Each structure stands twice: as C-alpha cells, then as structure tokens.
Symmetry: C3
C-alpha cells in the first residue's frame, strides 16, 4: 500500500499526461578577426565574412581556416602527380574517362606536369587546388573570443504553453553587457565559442586547425503542476564528430565554395576557397507533464491488482 | 461499469496505439516589389532579390527593409563617435586592442573623425555603416501582397501511412488561381503574407519596419480508425519573437550580408547590406492512433480493478 | 491465459520497456564531376562548388541537374511577353501602376510593340525577360547519375545516455576510402550513389532530373538496449516525396531561381538569372529505444491478472 503511492504514483510520474516540445531557435554571432599572413597581407574579418551561408539560424558555421586558389578559368590543363594517373604514353590515358579523384574528365593526349614527371591532360578550372596541409596555427584563431546569442522559444501544444529562454527577471541593461558563466551567470544566453568548446574538454585551436562539429543541447523538462517559474532550460555541450583517425573518413568539417568574377573582355574567372570551420548545431528537446485523472485511476487499479497478487503469493 | 467504457475507453483513447509524424515541407514565394527612393532611384525586386538565402525551404526569409553601404575597402580609417572610444591623446588609444563594438582592431595612433571630435584609428572596411534608424515606411511594403505556396508531405511509419496537404478533391484549375480564406477557401494552400501576419492580430507595416519572426503551425491529428478522408491538417499562425522593449535584446530580426566586386586594377570592394525582414518558420506536428487489442485488455483490467476498489470503499 | 499474458503482452507488446526518442545530427558530403557540351555555352565542367546551391545545407542538399540561363539583364523599361490577359489594344487598355501576379513587373500607362504582329503593355523590370521555354531534354547534368554522397549520422538517446554513430566500429578506413553502397554486397557502406538512391524508389533518374523532384532518405534507429549494443544498427529506406499526377498537384517537380550580380566599369549593374531544376534529397532520421523497467512490468502484470479474473468470471457464467 505504502510502496505503490510512494514510488509508482510519485516517482514514476504515472499521474502525468505528457507532451513533447515545439521549438524555434535564433542565433546571432558577434566578433572580429584579424589575419596578417604574407600571402594575403593584412586583412580583417567581420560577421559578414566568416559565416557561410549568411543565414542558417539553428545551425551556424564559423570559418576558422581556409585554402584559397585564385585566377581559376575553364581550360585544358594538366593533372596533379598520382601513381594512378601517371602517363607512360598517349595510349595510357583514355579520353572521356571521368575520374573520382576530382580533377576532371580525361583526354587522350597527356602533357608534362613538370620536367621530371608527366600526367594525363584534362579540361577543368585551372590552376588546380594544390594538395597542401592547412596552415597551423589557424588563420582565424581570434574566433576563440567570438560571442553567440541564442534565443529559444518553446511551445507545448496540448497544454497550450509558451515559454522563452530569456527569463522575465532579466533586464535589458544586464543583457547588453553579459556573458555566460556556469558558476556566476547561469541565466545569460550569450555564450562564448571558446567556452563552448572548453566545456567539452577540448582545445579550440586544435579543433579549428581542421574543423569539427559541436552541438548545443537545450533540455526543457518542465512539470506544469509545479509553478511556472520552475520551468527552466538546461544547457549541455557535446562534440558530434569522430576523432579516431582509424575508423572515420574525412576527419573534421570542411567544404568548398567559390567566387565568380567577369573581366572586361567577358571571360569568367573563379576563386575557390576550401574552408575548415566548426559547425555548431542547436538541439532542443524536452517533455512536459500535467496532472490527469484517468491515468491516476488506472495506475491505482493496477497497483491494487499487484497488491492482490503479492497477497496471494504470501498466502502460499 | 458505464463510466469506464464511457470515458476511459473512448475519450481517453486508451484503445489506441499512437505514433508521431515525419514531415517534409516545400515553400515557393511569388510577388514583385517596387522601390522609388531618392538614394537608389527606381528599382524593382523579384523572387531572386528579396529571399536570402535562395533556397531555405521550411524556413524562408523575406526582405522588407535594408541599409546599404557601398565602396567599402580594407583600409586604415576612423571610428564612429563614442564615449568609450573618444581619443584624448595618442596614449589614450591602445594598439592591438580588439573591441566588442564591431568597428575593428585599434591602433596606437588616433585621428580626427571630424573637426569637433577625434576618435581612435582602426583598420577595417571603410566607410563604416552609419548608425541610422531604418527608413519608415519600409522600402518593401508591397511585400504585404506576396503569396506563398506550402506543400507538406507527412508519413506515419508504424502504420505505414503517407499523406499530402493537397486534398485529392482539389483540381489543378482551382489551384492555378487560388488564395487562402478562412471562411471561403479553407483547403487552399496558397497563403498571403499580409493575411498570415493579420491572423496573429498584428499590422504588417509595423512588423516589417524592424522585422520579426512568424511561425506557421500545421497540426496533423488523424484517427486512422476513422476513414482516411477525415485526416486533414489544421493551420495556426503565431508570432515567435518578444515585443517588450524591456526584457528582450536586439528587437526584431535583422542580419548583415555582403557583395564582393573586383576592379580593373585588382582591388576588392564590398557592398554591405543590413537587412530587416520577417522570417517564417513552418512547424509541423501531429500524432496518429490506431486500434489495438493489448492496450484495450489492459485498460479493461485496470478499470475492473478500480471497480473492485470502489466497491470495497462503498462497502465500508 | 496465464501463459497468454507472458507470451504476448509482456514480451511482444514491449510493456516492460521504458521508451525514448532519438536526437540526431546528419552530415553530407557530395563528390562528382559533370560535363556539358551544349552549343549555347560551349564546353564547360562542373564540380562540387557549382551544382550545389546553397554551398552548405547539410541534412538537405540540392543537386543541380538542368538550368535555364538569362544574361545581360538590367533594370530598364521594357516590353512584356505575349499573353491574352496582357495584350494591348490601345494606351487606355493598360493601366499604370497595376502590379501583376504573372511575375513580369509593374505596368505603365503606355504600351509598346513586342513584335510586328503583336503589342503588349510596357513595364519596368530586369530585361531581357526569361523566355518561356521548356527545359532541355536530356538534362544538361545527366552525369549527376554517377555522383556519390557520404552520409554520417550521430544519434543520442538522452534518458538512457546513449550515443551512437552510423559508421560501425568493425569498419576500417581502408575499406571506406574505396567503398560504395550495395544492398546485397555492402550494407554497411554509408557512401550512396544518387542513381542508386533514385532507382531504389522504382524510378528513372533522367526523367526525374529533366524537371527535378524531391527524394527522401529515411534512417530508422530502432534499438533495444536490453540486447547487446552491437545489435543497434540503422535501416535505410528511400522514398519520393513529390506528387507525379499532373491533375492534382501544382508546379510539378522542384525548381527555383537565383541570380549573379556584376558591376561594369561605368558602374552599371548587370544580372544573370538562372532557373535551376534539380533533385533535392532530404535526410529524415527517426527511431525509438527501450530499456527494462520494474514499475511498468508490475503494472502490466497487475492488469493481466485483472484480465484473468475477468475471463474467469465470464467463463463461470
Ligand atoms: C579573397 C579571399 C581572401 C576571401 C575573402 C573573403 Br570576404 C572570404 N569570406 C567569404 O567570402 N564569406 C562569405 C560570405 C557570404 C557568402 N559567401 C561567402 C573568404 Br572565405 C576568402
Ligand atoms: C545594390 C543594392 C541596391 C541591392 C541589390 C540587391 Br539585387 C539586393 N538583394 C540581394 O542581393 N538578394 C540576394 C539574393 C541572393 C543572395 N544574396 C542576396 C540588395 Br539586399 C541590395
Ligand atoms: C554562367 C552560367 C553558365 C552558370 C555558371 C555557374 Br558556376 C553556375 N553554377 C552556380 O552558380 N552555382 C552556385 C554556387 C554557389 C552559390 N550559388 C550558385 C550556374 Br547555375 C550557371
Ligand atoms: C602585420 O605584419 C607586418 C609585417 O609582417 C607588420 O609590419 C605589421 O605591423 C603587422 N600588423 C599587425 C596588426 O600585426
Ligand atoms: C582572446 O582574448 C583573450 C583576452 O583578451 C586574449 O588573451 C587571447 O589572446 C584572445 N585570443 C586570441 C586567439 O588572440
Ligand atoms: C538589472 O538586473 C541585475 C541583475 O542582478 C540587477 O543587479 C540590477 O539591479 C537590475 N537593474 C535594475 C535597474 O533593476
Ligand atoms: C518615381 O519617382 C519619380 C520622382 O520621385 C517620379 O517621377 C516617377 O514617376 C516615380 N515612379 C513611380 C513608378 O512611382
Ligand atoms: C496590396 O494590394 C492592395 C490591393 O491591390 C493594395 O490596395 C495595397 O496598396 C497593396 N499594398 C501595398 C503596400 O501597396
Ligand atoms: C474544379 O474544382 C472546383 C472546386 O469547387 C469546382 O467548382 C469545379 O467545378 C472543378 N472543375 C471541374 C472541371 O471539375
Ligand atoms: C564537344 O563538342 C564539340 C563540337 O560539338 C566537339 O568538337 C568536342 O570534341 C566535344 N567535346 C567533348 C569532350 O565531348
Ligand atoms: C555513369 O557511369 C556509367 C559507368 O561508367 C556510364 O556507363 C554512364 O554513361 C554514366 N552516366 C552518364 C550520364 O554518362
Ligand atoms: C578492412 O576491412 C575489410 C572489410 O571486410 C577486410 O576485408 C580487411 O581485411 C580489413 N583490413 C585489415 C588490414 O584488417
């Protein structure tokens, strides 16, 4: 008798009708980066430069490192050295054979890539992207000091509940100059990228050399029987990409994009950037419960049946 | 006896095995806007101009107002007036100090922004974006008359159910020239942005002056025991961003993007646009139920146990 | 019925399971090269930076297959396309300032001769207009049939504190370097082929790519945590998501328009408008996991005993 109400009715939440969450997320990134490499000279980077695409709210990408190829035009051209594409004679290379290496469609003739070696001749954007390891340290290290503001609006449809992650006790003056600290400022929604990466027990620079995927998990576990002010979100940070170099393929997170230009004579030129960066995904989940009568009665009946069973067992 | 079957078996849906929904959404926007401001002259806007990014199906952004800065180049330059960045002497400004205001990295020297005042000297894209309130009325007011077509395809995996929001009774001739009216055309999926904003008890112009977030909620609550034709979606519209100027930070919804150009001599120029617009999010949710035997028997047993309990109570 | 309860309700109904949903992240990378040799454009190659718009939309990627290109478009006063609803009989026929829903532009009072035979209302917009021309057949990027896509899915069950990846630990990197997905031969390879994905839905790639369409990759994570961890594997299914009946749907296929902007020496702005038809792949991850519990088991046992009492009473009568 005491056991049923003690555990099944209370801790198991059998007296609760439950619902899931419907959420929307808005992210705004602020920060400025500087680069002083010899190849590019002296350059600054603002919010319109290191975020690709410009608006991907809910999952934003921050550029940290890049490889740039300029003055690329559609032309016949030479492949990079490779044992599987080395040219012994004109009959070695096959015309029209599309390769999976990403160079381009092959032609019958082959040309000398350098004095020492010759390779098959293909038509593509040239000059090709050199196979070079990304620079270390990363070009946009100062991305460690960027800030991100996250605004989350949740709704429980069955209970007709709407909530925001910005508590009503918080004034705008404090939000103007604010930062998230686990011990000092738990209600600030303005996180730091370096802090987010550190909370997962990782170093920002090593991750940003080759990129990676990070995930911000917001948990809305709210009991609507309790007062509304007890409904608060819980923030957790977790890496989402494999680090073992033996099991995964294509470590880190990188992708290629391009800029197109037209010259005076009308010819088209392309600048190809392969960017390595850290992609942050906002993952919102939760479940809410409210008191109900029918589930309570069914659980009480099942508990009484279990009491009858245990009484019968003890009788024997 | 009558109570159990009357309420617990029927209204509580205890005889139902339930499943969630798996949905895909496709949105297409049509409309044309005109602008006749003195700064830009006389310009037209089509679907390829006021949607950024071009394809974000499921959550589309419609530009309504903008601030444009042109001929921005990487150079040493002067900051905007600010009490926290006012220059008293060369020793006042600190070289290499990165600011959170978004201007750029500071240098030791400082220069006169105007005759009256002088500020610290920084290197960034210049000329800077002037701190100017967005124009009122909004530049793209005609965005009130745009139309959006929403196609939603849902599936319940456990029951192997597939459904579309376009009913089979609807012919293409009616869909060619169609609009959504709550009282007249409830099955048309072609909504009007002005109507969507009005259904939330708001004015379109005021919202579009500074932007905001809107949310279209589609509810698929379908009982598969009933015939298939009874499975229809329900559309609701709700604002998702705070309007109180005292609690939220960064009111409205705006973001910055850029266009890059290359001159004949090779120098790079940027045109920075800060755009204010209304972001519509499509939020699809639902739950379906079908008859089952085991849950029915368990509920009948629990009801009989409750009947035994109430009989015992009445005996005492 | 004592046997029946344990045989069916306790075991097959999974009444002894506390259940949780899945929280997933998806990463997609596309590799392939296309060639076009049309007379209008000449001889062009296409890489991963050309046929994917936008460049990063991980979880739902769009692959360009066919396109219509209009060049040298500038803001100017100009003439409309022929149309019975926009044909000009006289200057009083066209109304100035009347915005149309056809997508041409705002109308002006005057009207001009589109050709010698016919005249139409005069509007200000980007010109020359996009000609109303059927998309080329066969599609320009047919070689998109041979592209490959790598899908990496990371799932978590929060209540049970479970984290899993779709790349099994038994798989080595050497096999993943040169790998392809075959239902009968290589079920654990996550490197799919677009042609194979379309074929698994009983469709032809070329016909779909002529006008575009929407495809959906469904990954099912139905894992029983009571069983060992190695039994937790995903199941891949492929389904078309857009209607094919030309009588019920509107705007068949999947296409959208985008633009490129250029600035000339004198400062005037020019636009190149591309209407692209392509196949959009959506990754849809769903699942549910269960683990043993005591309270649900006891409640189900009690309900089964109550049902046993009911059936005994019924048999007595
Ligand atoms: C020329 C080179 C040094 C260079 C310049 C810039 Br600016 C950027 N950054 C961007 O283009 N960001 C961006 C924004 C919006 C859409 N697409 C991309 C890069 Br990666 C390389
Ligand atoms: C020069 C100024 C008057 C101007 C011109 C245009 Br055109 C636009 N619109 C866009 O660039 N839209 C858009 C589309 C695709 C990708 N990125 C942006 C803007 Br906001 C300002
Ligand atoms: C000039 C014409 C032949 C042409 C050239 C190209 Br290159 C492309 N392709 C793209 O522009 N892809 C793309 C990538 C990133 C952002 N926006 C678009 C197209 Br459709 C037409
Ligand atoms: C950038 O580097 C150059 C030489 O490498 C140096 O003269 C200059 O002071 C540097 N600027 C900054 C801001 O570090
Ligand atoms: C980030 O800011 C701190 C404090 O100003 C500074 O010490 C650190 O060097 C900055 N990070 C980088 C990469 O410069
Ligand atoms: C704003 O909120 C902070 C948070 O503690 C508080 O210290 C401060 O007094 C508040 N300001 C006003 C004017 O109430
Ligand atoms: C735009 O404004 C100019 C002057 O401000 C005027 O002459 C012209 O008729 C206007 N055009 C439209 C379409 O309103
Ligand atoms: C939208 O259309 C209506 C009817 O044609 C018109 O009265 C209204 O002015 C239009 N909106 C704007 C912003 O011009
Ligand atoms: C098309 O559907 C509309 C909707 O009511 C109907 O009025 C009309 O008769 C239908 N047309 C045909 C040809 O059936
Ligand atoms: C492209 O077409 C031209 C003529 O139409 C032909 O000369 C050339 O060989 C073709 N190239 C390829 C790679 O098919
Ligand atoms: C795809 O590859 C196969 C095998 O190499 C080839 O037969 C086929 O023609 C290719 N597809 C296209 C569209 O060329
Ligand atoms: C890599 O995995 C494949 C998969 O069967 C296997 O055949 C091969 O022997 C493995 N290589 C090594 C070095 O274990």
């Amino acid at each position: 008798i005491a056991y049923v109400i003690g555990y099944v009715c209370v801790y198991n939440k059998g007296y609760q009708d439950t619902d899931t969450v419907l959420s929307s997320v808005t992210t705004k990134v602020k920060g400025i980066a500087l680069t002083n490499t010899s190849e590019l000279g002296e350059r600054i980077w603002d919010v319109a430069d290191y975020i690709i695409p410009p608006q991907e709210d809910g999952s934003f990408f921050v550029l940290t490192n890049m490889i740039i190829t300029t003055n690329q035009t559609q032309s016949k051209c030479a492949e990079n050295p490779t044992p599987a594409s080395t040219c012994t004679s004109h009959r070695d290379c096959k015309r029209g054979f599309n390769d999976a290496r990403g160079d381009g469609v092959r032609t019958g003739r082959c040309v000398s890539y350098s004095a020492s070696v010759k390779t098959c001749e293909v038509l593509s954007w040239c000059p090709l992207e050199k196979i070079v390891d990304p620079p270390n340290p990363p070009l946009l290290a100062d991305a460690e000091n960027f800030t991100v503001l996250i605004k989350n609006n949740i709704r429980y449809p069955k209970f007709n509940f709407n909530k925001r992650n910005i508590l009503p006790n918080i004034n705008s003056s404090y939000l103007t100059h604010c930062v998230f600290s686990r011990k000092t400022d738990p209600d600030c929604p303005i996180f730091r990228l370096g802090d987010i990466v550190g909370e997962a027990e990782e170093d920002f620079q090593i991750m940003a050399v080759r990129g990676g995927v990070m995930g911000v998990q917001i948990r809305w576990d709210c009991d609507l029987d309790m007062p509304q002010s007890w409904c608060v979100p819980r923030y957790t940070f977790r890496r989402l990409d494999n680090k073992d170099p033996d099991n995964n393929v294509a470590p880190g997170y990188n992708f290629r994009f391009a800029k197109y230009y037209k010259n005076s004579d009308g010819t088209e030129t392309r600048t190809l950037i392969k960017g390595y960066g850290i992609r942050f995904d906002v993952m919102v989940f939760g479940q809410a419960g409210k008191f109900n009568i029918i589930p309570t009665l069914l659980n009480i009946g099942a508990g009484l049946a279990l009491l009858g069973l245990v009484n019968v067992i003890c009788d024997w």
